[PDB]
């Protein structure tokens, strides 16, 4: 809605699941995303990357770029 660009859509969509957060927790994807989706994603998004992060945060923004862009080809 307020954003659109394939990669931006996933970030805006993930932000909603993480509850207005620059990162998402593994447990959140398990209860917010099909158990199978949380496990697969929890692997893509590296270990978040913020200043006031938390003990167990993940960055879906890094994973979004890989889904629509992985290695040059």
């Amino acid at each position: 809605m307020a954003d659109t660009d394939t990669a931006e859509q996933v970030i805006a969509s993930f932000r909603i699941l993480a509850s207005d957060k620059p990162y998402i927790l593994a447990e959140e994807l398990r209860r917010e995303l099909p158990p199978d989706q949380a496990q697969y994603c929890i692997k893509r998004m590296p270990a978040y990357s913020g200043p006031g992060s938390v003990p167990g945060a993940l960055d879906y923004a890094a994973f979004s770029s890989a889904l629509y862009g992985e290695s040059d080809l």
Binding site: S13, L33, Y40, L67
Partner: peptide, 23 residues
């Protein structure tokens, strides 16, 4: 309705990368 729509986008995007998974 707003949150469910976001999950559809994340799930749809997740299935895209999964399609690249052999059997």
């Amino acid at each position: 309705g707003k949150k469910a729509e976001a999950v559809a986008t994340v799930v749809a995007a997740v299935d895209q990368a999964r399609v690249r998974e052999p059997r």
